[PDB]
C-alpha cells in the first residue's frame, strides 16, 4: 500500500 | 490547515 | 507537505 | 511493484 | 508487464 | 496480451 | 503526470 | 512532487 | 485515462 | 480469443 502523512496549509 | 493521513491500495 | 511512500501491487 | 516516494504540496 | 514512470503533484 | 496506455495525474 | 504502458497477459 | 516508477503484473 | 486493448489468453 | 477495447476510467 501507498502511505501518506502530513498536512497542507490552504485547501484550494 | 488540513491534516492528511491514510493509505491507498490502487493507483488510479 | 504530505509525505508519500510505499508500493502498490495492482494498477486499477 | 510500483514504488512511490516524495511529497505533495497541493490537495486539489 | 505494465511499466509506470513520472510524478504526481496533487493529492486528488 | 492486453496492452495498456495512458496517464494518471492524481494520487487518489 | 505518471505515464503507464506495457502489456499484461491476464486482467487478473 | 511524488516520484512513481516500477511495474505491476496484474491490472486489477 | 488509461486505454486498454488486446486479447486475453488463459493459463491452460 | 476474446478481444478487448476501451478505457479503465470513463470520461464524462
UniProtKB/Swiss-Prot annotation, chains A, B, C, D, E, F, G, H, I, J:
Subcellular location as annotated: Cytoplasm; Nucleus
Processing and modification events after translation: The ditryptophan cross-link at Trp-5 is responsible for the non-disulfide-linked homodimerization. Such modification might only occur in extreme conditions and additional experimental evidence is required.
Record-annotated membrane-spanning stretches: none
Cross-link (1-(tryptophan-3-yl)-tryptophan (Trp-Trp) (interchain with W-33)): 5
Subunit structure: Homodimer; non-disulfide-linked. Homodimerization may take place via the ditryptophan cross-link at Trp-5. Heterodimer with SOD1. The heterodimer CCS:SOD1 interacts with SLC31A1; this heterotrimer is Cu(1+)-mediated and its maintenance is regulated through SOD1 activation. Interacts with DAOA; the interaction is direct.
Disease as annotated in the protein's UniProt record: Amyotrophic lateral sclerosis 1: A neurodegenerative disorder affecting upper motor neurons in the brain and lower motor neurons in the brain stem and spinal cord, resulting in fatal paralysis. Sensory abnormalities are absent. The pathologic hallmarks of the disease include pallor of the corticospinal tract due to loss of motor neurons, presence of ubiquitin-positive inclusions within surviving motor neurons, and deposition of pathologic aggregates. The etiology of amyotrophic lateral sclerosis is likely to be multifactorial, involving both genetic and environmental factors.
Family affiliation: Belongs to the Cu-Zn superoxide dismutase family.
Additional notes on this entry: The protein (both wild-type and ALS1 variants) has a tendency to form fibrillar aggregates in the absence of the intramolecular disulfide bond or of bound zinc ions. These aggregates may have cytotoxic effects. Zinc binding promotes dimerization and stabilizes the native form.
Functional description taken from the UniProt entry: Destroys radicals which are normally produced within the cells and which are toxic to biological systems.
Protein's name in the database: Superoxide dismutase [Cu-Zn]
